[PDB]
Symmetry: C3
Subunit: 530 residues, 3 copies
C-alpha cells in the first residue's frame, strides 16, 4: 500500500530575502485641529512589509491634583489608521476596530500601556510634584498583512506607501479630577509618534494578486435601535454592538479602580468611596451634608431600617462623647413622589469596623452589600438630572471633589466592563428579507468560542475558509432583487424608569468586513468585489 511520509519532508528552498526592523519619524499636522501623523515608506529595496508597531512617548506630568491614563492608553490614542499608495487607500481601520481586533492579544495590550505606573490614579501635592514619569508605549497596528507572515505581507511594487495615523484628543486617554489643571495639560500635550515595521528586501520577487478584508462601521443615531450598511456586495462578516453616549453628562464618575480592572475591583473602589459618608462617627449630628440628607443615629441593636431594608452598623472603640451615624439616602433616584426609589444606602446590609483614636477615622473591616458594576458606571450628572424629583447626590463636598472625569472612547454597553447585555432581540436583513434573527446572544457565544475570546460581540461570520491560501467565502449581493444592503434592528431590554441607568443614552454600532482584491499591476491598488 502507498503511504504518505509523516517522518520526513523535502525542505523546499524559499524565495531569497532579508528582513529588517525599520523605524521612521513622522510629520505632525493639526487638521477640528486633530493631531495627524504621516509616515512615508519609499525605497527600491523595501520589497514588502508587515507587523506595523506605533510607539508613543508620553510626557512627564507635573503639578497638582489626581491624574491617570486609561488602560491600554496606546490603543485609546488612535482615532483612525490609513495605509495608502498613489492609487488610493489600500486598507484603513477605525481606532475602536483596531482595538477590538487586538482584545485577545494580551502581549499587544500590555505593550500599549497597561501598568500601575500608568493606569493607577496618582496624586500631585505641589505645583512641581511629579504625578507621572515619562514613559514609552507600543501599539501593534494589526493589519491583514500579518495573517500568514511573508505570504500575506504588503508588497511595494516600486510604489510610495503612506501610513496616516489620526489621534483622539488627549481628553479621551486621561482620567482626572477638578483639581488637575487639564486646560494647561491639553495646551502643553503633544503626540510624539514613531512607526516601526518588518521590512523585507526580496531578490526576484514573484508577485501574485491577493484578497483583503476592509472593515467599515456605521453608528446609528442616539437611542435609534436601527442601523444600515449600504452597497454590501461581498462581506466576510458582520458585527453588532452597543456603545454608551455621555454627551448629556459632564463625564464625571464617583470612583475608578485604576490598574485593577476586574468587576470586583470596580465595585470595591465605589464601596470604599461611599463608606466615608455612609457611616460617620461624630459628637452630635454630622455636619457638611445637604439638608436633603437623612443621617440617622444607629440604635443600641445596631439595626437602622430604611423602609423594608435593614442595615446592621457596629463600630468598635467609639469615644464616649461620640455616636455612630448612618446616611440613609447617600444617593437616591425617583421619577415621582409616590414611585419606587433607588437608594444606594439600601444596597448595604452590614458594616463593621473600628474607630482609630490616633488618626480620628473609622477603619472598616467587613462590608455586606449588593453593589453591582452598573452602580459604578452611573455618571454623577444622572443622579442630579431633571427627571429626579429628589436632590440625588447627598454626599459631602469632600467626596464630590474626588469625582473623576472618564472619557474612554472604547466603552461598550451600559457599564465599564460591558457585563450587562442590553440587546433583547437582534434582526439582520439582507435587502428586505430576514437574513438572521435571535432572541439570545448565541452569535456572541459563537464569536467567543470560535475566536477563543472572553470579550466578543454579536457576530455573523460568513467565511469559515482558511485565509490567504483561499479566496474568502462571502455573502454575495443581488442588486436586481434588492439584496445590496445589511439592515440591523435591535430590541433593547426594558429597564425600570426609577433606576439612573435607564437614562444612559445608547448607540448601535454595526461593523461590516467587505472583500477587496489587491492588484499590483503598475502600483498597489484595491478593487471592491461587486
Amino acid at each position: 500500500i502507498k503511504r504518505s511520509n509523516v517522518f520526513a519532508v523535502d525542505s523546499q528552498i524559499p524565495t531569497l530575502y532579508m528582513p529588517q526592523y525599520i523605524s521612521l519619524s513622522g510629520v505632525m499636522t493639526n487638521d477640528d485641529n486633530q493631531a495627524i501623523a504621516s509616515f512615508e515608506i519609499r525605497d527600491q529595496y523595501i520589497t514588502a512589509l508587515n507587523h506595523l508597531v506605533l510607539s508613543l512617548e508620553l510626557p512627564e506630568v507635573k503639578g497638582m491634583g489626581r491624574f491617570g491614563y486609561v488602560p491600554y492608553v496606546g490603543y485609546k490614542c488612535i482615532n483612525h489608521v490609513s495605509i495608502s499608495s498613489c492609487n488610493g487607500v489600500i486598507w484603513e481601520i477605525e481606532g475602536e476596530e483596531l482595538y477590538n481586533n487586538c482584545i485577545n492579544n494580551t502581549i499587544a495590550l500590555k505593550h500599549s500601556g497597561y501598568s500601575s505606573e500608568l493606569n493607577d490614579i496618582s496624586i500631585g501635592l505641589t505645583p512641581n510634584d511629579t504625578i507621572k514619569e515619562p514613559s514609552t508605549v507600543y501599539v501593534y497596528i494589526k493589519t491583514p498583512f500579518d495573517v500568514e507572515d511573508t505570504f500575506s505581507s504588503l508588497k511595494l511594487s516600486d510604489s510610495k506607501i503612506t501610513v496616516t495615523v489620526t489621534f483622539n484628543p488627549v481628553s479621551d486617554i486621561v482620567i482626572r479630577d477638578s483639581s488637575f489643571d487639564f486646560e494647561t495639560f491639553n495646551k502643553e500635550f503633544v503626540y510624539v509618534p514613531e512607526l516601526s515595521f518588518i521590512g523585507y528586501m526580496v531578490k526576484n520577487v514573484q508577485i501574485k494578486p491577493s484578497f483583503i478584508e476592509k472593515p467599515r462601521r456605521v453608528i446609528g443615531q442616539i437611542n435609534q435601535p436601527t442601523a444600515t450598511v449600504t452597497e454590501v456586495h461581498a462581506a466576510t462578516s458582520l458585527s453588532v454592538y452597543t456603545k454608551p453616549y455621555y454627551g448629556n453628562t459632564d463625564n464625571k464618575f464617583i470612583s475608578y479602580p485604576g490598574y485593577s480592572q476586574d468587576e470586583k475591583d470596580y465595585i470595591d473602589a465605589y464601596v470604599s468611596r461611599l463608606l466615608d459618608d455612609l457611616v460617620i462617627v461624630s459628637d452630635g449630628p454630622p455636619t457638611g451634608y445637604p439638608e436633603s440628607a437623612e443621617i440617622v443615629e444607629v440604635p443600641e441593636d445596631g439595626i437602622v431600617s430604611i423602609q423594608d431594608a435593614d442595615v446592621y452598623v457596629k463600630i468598635d472603640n467609639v469615644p464616649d462623647n461620640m455616636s455612630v451615624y448612618l446616611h440613609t439616602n447617600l444617593l437616591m433616584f425617583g421619577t415621582r413622589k409616590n414611585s419606587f426609589i433607588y437608594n444606594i444606602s439600601k444596597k448595604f446590609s452590614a458594616i463593621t469596623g473600628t474607630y482609630s483614636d490616633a488618626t480620628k477615622r473609622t477603619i472598616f473591616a467587613h462590608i455586606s452589600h449588593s453593589i453591582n458594576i452598573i452602580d459604578t458606571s452611573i455618571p454623577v450628572s444622572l443622579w442630579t438630572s431633571q427627571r429626579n424629583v429628589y436632590n440625588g447626590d447627598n454626599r459631602s463636598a469632600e467626596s464630590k471633589a474626588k469625582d473623576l472625569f472618564i472619557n474612554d472612547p472604547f466603552i461598550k454597553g451600559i457599564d465599564f466592563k460591558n457585563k450587562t447585555d442590553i440587546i433583547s432581540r437582534l434582526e439582520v436583513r439582507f435587502g428586505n428579507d430576514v437574513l438572521y434573527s435571535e432572541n439570545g446572544p448565541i452569535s456572541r457565544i459563537y464569536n467567543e468560542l470560535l475566536t477563543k475570546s472572553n470579550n466578543g460581540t454579536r457576530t455573523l461570520t460568513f467565511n469559515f475558509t482558511p485565509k490567504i491560501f483561499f479566496r474568502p467565502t462571502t455573502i454575495t449581493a443581488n442588486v436586481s432583487r434588492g439584496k445590496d444592503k445589511l439592515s440591523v434592528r435591535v430590541v433593547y431590554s426594558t429597564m425600570d424608569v426609577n433606576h439612573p441607568i435607564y437614562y444612559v443614552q445608547k448607540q448601535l454600532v454595526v461593523v461590516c468586513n467587505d472583500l477587496y482584491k489587491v492588484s499590483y499591476d503598475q502600483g498597489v491598488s484595491i478593487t471592491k468585489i461587486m
Copy 2:
C-alpha cells in the same frame, strides 16, 4: 536608505525557489453558513431526555453544537448554589444518530474532560459568583438565585478542522439526544433548603444550536472518527478491563470517589473561589467559630464528648504532643479564652493513634469585638490540607470511630452542605492527592505500558496544553482529518483483544477518615470508526 548597505550588497539566481511572498488564492466550495437554533422534545428511571431532529434538504453539513439551558429563579429559605460549570454537570450522555444508528456518543464526564482546557466553553456553561457562590434565603418568598441562561459547547470530532471535519448530512435525518443528570448533582444546598419541592418544580429547558452549512454541489468522501468508551471498575478494586479493543487511538486512566456510603454532606464549600487555598480557608473559617471561644465561664452548647480547655496566661494549650498558641486581644475582664481540643477526632482503638483536627492548629491570633460580641481572627498558623475539606461528615461519626467524632456546635452542623457533583476525581475536591502509586496497562498477557510516576499525565498536559490532564497513552501522533489515525492493532489469536489496567493504590492510615472514601477506577478508550456516507450516514468499527 532605510535598508542597510550590508543587506543590499549581501543579496545583490540559478536555483529553483518556492514562493514565500505570494500564493494562488484557490476558489473554495460554494457554501453559506447559518447559526440554527432548535427546541427539543422532553421525555422522562424518570431521567430527562431531550431530542433534537435535524432534517432539511439545504442543511448539507453541520458542526459546533452548543446546548443552552434556562436556569429558573430559585426562591425560598436556606442555603443554595450551583456547582461550577453547571451546564456541563447537567449532561449525563449525548448521542448523535441517524437512521442507520449512532454516529457518535459521549458520557457527560468525558465531554467535560474534553472541554476542561477551554476556558471560554467552561465560562459559558456557568462559572460566576452569581451562580456558584452559596446564597442564602431568609423568608419563604426571598429570591436565592435569579434566572440565568447557560451555554454548553458539545465538542464533537466535527469541529477539529471546521468545514473539512463537519458532519455531512447525506439527505438523512440526524437526531441529537441529550440525557440529563438529576438536579441533585448540579446543586449545593443545606438542610434548611426545601430540595423536595425544588426537585418536583425543576424542569430542564434546553435548546440546541449548531453552525449549519448550505453547500452547492458537495463532493463527499469517507472519513474517520474516534468514539470514546469508558469502563468503571468495582468499588475499591484496583483493576478494570476494556474488552473488544481492535483499533484504539488513546487510553486514559483516572480515579473517582464513591460517596454512596455517606449522606453526601460536607462541613464547608468555598463557592466561586475554586483554588486549593480557597477550599482550605473556607474550612478553617467554619471551624474557627467553635475552635476559639471567648466566654464568661465554661462554654455551652457543645456535646459532653467535647474537651474545651481554658487558655493559660502563656497562651500555650497542649493537646498531647501538639502545642496551640492562642492570644486574643480586648478580652473582657469577666470573660476567658477557651480552646476546643477535640473539635473533630477519629480512632479505631481505645488507646491507639488519634486524628484530631484541633491538633492541626499551631497559632491563633485575633481581637474580640465588644460591639458585635464576637472574635475577629487576624492570623492563623495551621496544617489543614485539601483532604480535610473533602472528608464527608458521615465518616467523622461512622461506626468505626470509637469517639463521638463531631464535637462541633448545633449551629455549625446546621450550616453543613450537600455536594453531589458528578465529575469529582481522586479523593479530594481538587484532585490534588495522587493515590495511584503505580500503573500497569496489559494488552493481553504482555505488558503494553507501566509507570511509577505520572509521566503519562505530564505528556498529556504538555501535548494538549492543559493544566488538568489524566494518565493518558496516546497512539495517534498523525495529523487529524487529513490522515487515517494511527492505532494500537489487536491480535485476536494471541488473546491481545482487551486492555487490562491494574493500579497499586497508596497506603493510608486507618485512623484518618479519608481511608474510608471508596475509590473507583475509570478507564477511557477511544475506538476508531469509519464514517460511510453511502446512502445515509453510518459508522463501522475498525477491526
Copy 3:
C-alpha cells in the same frame, strides 16, 4: 429555525478546491511509546547524567522530558526552592551520536525557550509547597516533603511532531545532562545547615521521550538551528560571536554578577512572584525595625542607629522627608519610635545619602497587648523592585562611609541566600531597562542599531511572550517544510562575525545598585544540515 429563504435563493464552470471533504491519506506505519530511562551519574566536581538510547524498535524520537526526585529536607532553619526549580537545575543539555553533537543548549537558553510555556514551567516545580520559604524548628522537623519535578527539554525535533522527529539510523544516541550546584536552586538562611545538605544532596534524574517504531522509514535530510552563547567580560558593553556564516537569529540581554557579594538578600516573596509581592515582602521585613513600640529608647540596635521618638502630631522629619507615624492602643508606659536610618548609603560624608527610612511617608497600625507586637494596617511608601534586589553586602561595603545596615540582629539572621542562575537585568523581575542603545555589526558594517527596545517588542509580539529579549530575527519562513532564511557571510570581505556594542545607562554612585556587576549575553542560532547517511551527523552551513 432551518435554512432561511434568503440564503437558499443566494446559492440556487470554475474549478473548486473541496473544503468539505478530504482523502484520508494512509500515513507511514508506526507505533509510539513513552520510554523512560535511568541515567549514569558522574562527578568543580559537577553532576553529569548520561542516557544511552539504542534499540532496533526505536526508529525516531522527540519530546524529551527529564524528571527529578527532590529529597525530603529535614532539620532547622529557613529553606525553599527557586521557582521553576527543574529548569534551574540544568546547566547544559547535549544530544550526540557516534559522529558527534547533533544538538546542544545552555541551561538558561532552554529555560528562555520555555518561558512562554506555562504548562512546562508549572511541571518543572512552581507551587507554594516547593517555592514558599518553609521553617524547620527541630533537628528532625520536616521543612520540605519529597517531590518529583518534570522538565520539558524542548528540542527542534518537536516543532512538527513526527515530521521534525530525530531519526536514529541504527545509531546510538547519548543525551548528556550537566547539573548546576544545588546552591543555585535553593533559597536558605544562616540557621539552615547547607554544608550537610550539599554533601547529602544527590540529583536523581530520569529521561523520558516519545519513541517511534517505524516500519520501512523513508529518511530525508533536514535543517536544525543550534544556539551558541557568548558572555562578555564583567561590565564590558561589548561581546562578539565569531564564525557567523548562516544565522537564523541573534538575541542580546544582560545578567547581574554577584561574585563580589555573599549572595545574601534581606527578603524574598516565595511562591508569589509579582513585582508588588517582592516589594511587600521587603516592606514587611523592614517594618518591625522601622516602627518600635517601647518603654524608653529601644535596645538591640547598633550605636549608628538614630531611633527618634514620634512627636504628638505624628510627623518625624528626616531632612526634607516627612514620615507620619500613628499607632493605636499604645500602653501609657510606652512610646512610638521611628528608625530614621534603617539602611543608609553614601560615598562621601556630608553629601547625598540613600536612606531607606526616607522612602516611607505614612505608617498606621494597632499595638497588640496580647502578643506584645505592632499590627500594621496601611503603609504609604516609594520602595521599588531595585531595593528588594540589593544584596546585603553592598549596604556594608567599603564604598559606604556609614555603617549601612542598622537593623536588629533578629532581622539580619532572617536574611536569605539567593543564587538563582537565570536572573536578568539588575533586579529580580528584570523590570529596569539598563540598555540605552544597541549596535549590531556583521563584520565591520552596521547590520542593525536601535535607541528603543523595538527588537524586544517584536520578539514579544512574534513569540506571544511577556518576557522577551532584544532579538533580531532573520528567518520568517515556516520551519521544517522550508530551508531557513539566514544572514550570509563573506569571508573575503571579512563579514563572518557578529559584534554587539551596547550603551548602558549609568546609575547614581550614591545608590547601592550602582555596585551590582553586569554581564552582556549574546545568543546566536546557527544553521546546520542534518545528514542520516551512515549514522546521524550535522554539518555547519557556510
